[PDB]
Design a protein around this nucleic acid. Structure first.
Ligand SMILES: [Mg+2]
Ligand SMILES: [Mg+2]
Ligand SMILES: [Mg+2]
Lengths: 249, 255
DNA sequence: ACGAATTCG
DNA sequence: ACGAATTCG
């Protein structure tokens, strides 16, 4: 019993080349055919595109206006049981926490995504949001496997300020030994989309999990969306993360 | 006049006089000088002095010896009342990472039968430069601690501090006190920069800060007596001498 | 969605 | 020399 997924901030707020870039995202999704896709910065017409292009997935969204997150669940692999949205009462960017309860065969999951408050300036609110996420991860029954995957905008120091990850919550990248090839998910040296004429890189996109001992084992982690499209730009200013995991009973 | 009874007292003004605003500057300098004439402080600590402003001080505050923190741009100064203060030396300590030509100016003097190290600075400005401002504060506090134990150390200047930043510094050292805090945090002189009450910068909003502060090293030998704002009167041009209020402080040196 | 600089109210 | 918003590099 395995589960595979992609998490990706697809920069729907960039209107430039957006249709081509959306098609680019989905060409990448088609190659890997993940069980679950967690998306951030979806906008309404992008969601409308996904409802047709990804009609083979159940699509759950974090809002209906502005920009928002989504979780796509592969029909026939993933059974959708419920969705839950938890607000971030002090967000200035309409951010929230989107959760879905699902099963794959006999295994129950709570899958969660968010786009935490952006920029250095909003560190304090981002930390409060992270605490909300970690709190929610603890609520599921012990028998349920909890996975958060999303755009956290985190700096390592902010996780320390937060108290560090709890003893029963793990970061998939850390678990896999901090591989260098997929460390940075936002990198202005390698990615030209924002036209930032400087080199900055961050591990903004992260995966946290809580599972009974050895019931969830990350197997691989890889960057996706690394190829330029016809327009000479990438699907997004972020790279996506493709993760495969086994559920070991 | 300063007679026998007041011989144990040092009085001073600290004031960022906004020499970077050239508009109405000569009239505003005359306003500052009128205040100095009224209170006749022993020492004046100034920030944002520019070279033309030194000429205005030589004309309208001629009884003060002027010691400056630099020769060009904008800089601090310490003014010493002739006949009261004996000038012994001046020291300038750089702030190697300043982006605003800031530094620490110290003047060693004798006054009223006591040796003093008088210090001023204009610490790095704006919220954005908090980290550098904190580094500079540490330099200042370190220098206050280094002075010979017999000397009385007083810093007065424009610190640009927010209260949270002093905490991040770990707070003032054990033998260093803030004069305003010492006097019980009086409300009348709490804010030294206030855009509701002062319109020189034409900021269309109401913000207020205790940017200008006085620190002293002491045990029981230096006792603040009073702290008051100055420069709260509009001049003929309808503007204040500066965007900051000045602070007038008197301290007693005790056996 | 970087840090630095600048504009706006 | 404010904070927020925007622009610049
Ligand atoms: Mg973005
Ligand atoms: Mg593997
Ligand atoms: Mg100023």
């Amino acid at each position: 019993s395995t589960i595979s997924f992609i998490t990706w901030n697809i920069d729907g707020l960039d209107g430039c080349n957006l249709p081509e870039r959306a098609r680019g995202v989905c060409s990448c999704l088609a190659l890997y055919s993940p069980d679950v896709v967690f998306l951030q910065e979806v906008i309404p017409p992008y969601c409308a595109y996904l409802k047709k292009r990804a009609a083979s997935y159940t699509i759950i969204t974090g809002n209906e206006e502005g920009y928002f997150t989504a979780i796509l669940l592969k029909k026939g692999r993933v059974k959708f049981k419920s969705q839950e949205i938890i607000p971030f009462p002090n967000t200035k960017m309409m951010r929230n926490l989107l959760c879905v309860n699902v099963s794959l065969g006999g295994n129950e999951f709570c899958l969660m995504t968010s786009h935490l408050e952006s920029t250095r300036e909003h560190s304090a609110e981002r930390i409060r949001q992270l605490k909300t996420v970690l709190g929610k991860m603890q609520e599921a029954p012990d028998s349920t496997t909890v996975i958060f995957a999303g755009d956290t905008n985190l700096r390592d120091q902010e996780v320390i300020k937060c108290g560090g990850l709890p003893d029963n919550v793990f970061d998939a990248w850390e678990f896999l030994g901090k591989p260098k090839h997929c460390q940075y998910t936002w990198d202005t040296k390698a990615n030209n989309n924002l036209r930032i004429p400087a080199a900055y890189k961050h591990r903004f996109d992260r995966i946290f999990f809580r599972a009974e001992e050895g019931h969830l084992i990350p197997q691989s982690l890889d960057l996706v969306g690394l190829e330029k499209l016809d327009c000479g730009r990438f699907p997004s200013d972020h790279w996506g993360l493709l993760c495969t995991l086994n559920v070991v009973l």
